[PDB]
């Protein structure tokens, strides 16, 4: 599918270089600081939306993550499907599992407003073409009492970096 | 000041080659964009901010902004402070106008839609703006005086939210090319 949406916002100093690539290929190498989060994805987000990606490169070496990432309005949530990460696995109040794309995942809530969060048991090999079935872990999150807003907002396959360096290539449809 | 904060949101096709420089540096070089918005300023606004800036720069060819660019909750609002434009020189619902940096500025509001995915949700939300009467000239240090346009906004019953977010020295540009080159403090 073709993404229709490019998202790169950086927080605090440091090197953060994104490249927006033609399609839905993005590449990000940082050395910061602060924090980031830059994707290829969707202006409006759905529950029922397969994400394709294929991670070409990722190498963190600190604190990042390679996740779906989006918000709900009506309320306002924010939300994560992490695939892989770097030197902290992000976890916070465990919910519950939920199988899908051949692996399984941790469920989470982190804390004001809520974050809901899938987060792999082990890193995802990356390379080769990968899918979410978002819907997968919108029907868990809903069994756990963790349900999303009505007013859809974006929704992409990013890389975050906290105070780390490291580089990402992904290409995502 | 030292900004802390990027943003570059890139809507549709076309090419939008935006950079994240040194310091309050920033450039964008672009052709047949659908929309984006790209700016360094501040995670967190203030109505009191004074934002310095350097558009050594500014050659939109077709409909492009160089504008303050801010949000509000409680209630949700957007805002601009636009000090150059290309081809179209943005307007809306006239208010009235207001002095400030050596300018004057037009002040409008328009009207977005809240919730365009739900279908029999027809809630707005509303947009602020200050449009300079004429191009501002670049190339020299540049003030916005944030405080003037909001004070005047509120004389005309245009209040902000209680909640900020972001306040960039913003590029936006519709359906058009260019590059603009902007150091923001």
């Given at each position: 599918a073709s993404t229709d949406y490019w998202?790169?916002?950086?927080?605090?100093?440091?090197?953060?270089?994104?490249v927006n690539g033609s399609g839905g290929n993005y590449s990000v190498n940082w050395s910061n600081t602060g924090n980031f989060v830059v994707g290829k994805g969707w202006t409006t987000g759905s529950p029922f939306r397969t994400?394709?990606?294929?991670?070409?490169?990722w190498a963190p070496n600190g604190n990042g993550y390679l996740t779906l990432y989006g918000w709900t309005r009506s309320p306002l949530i924010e939300y994560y499907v992490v695939d892989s990460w770097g030197t902290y696995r992000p976890t916070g109040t465990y919910k519950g599992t939920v199988k899908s794309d051949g692996g399984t995942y941790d469920i989470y809530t982190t804390t004001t407003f809520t974050q809901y969060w899938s987060v792999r048991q082990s890193k995802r090999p990356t390379g080769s073409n990968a899918t979410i079935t978002?819907?997968?872990?919108?029907?868990?999150?809903?069994?756990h009492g963790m349900n999303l807003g009505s007013n859809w907002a974006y929704q992409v396959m990013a890389t975050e970096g906290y105070q780390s360096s490291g580089s990402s290539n992904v290409t995502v449809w």
């Open positions: 998202q790169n916002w950086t927080f605090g100093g440091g090197i953060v270089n994104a994400i394709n990606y294929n991670a070409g490169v978002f819907s997968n872990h919108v029907n868990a999150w809903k069994s």
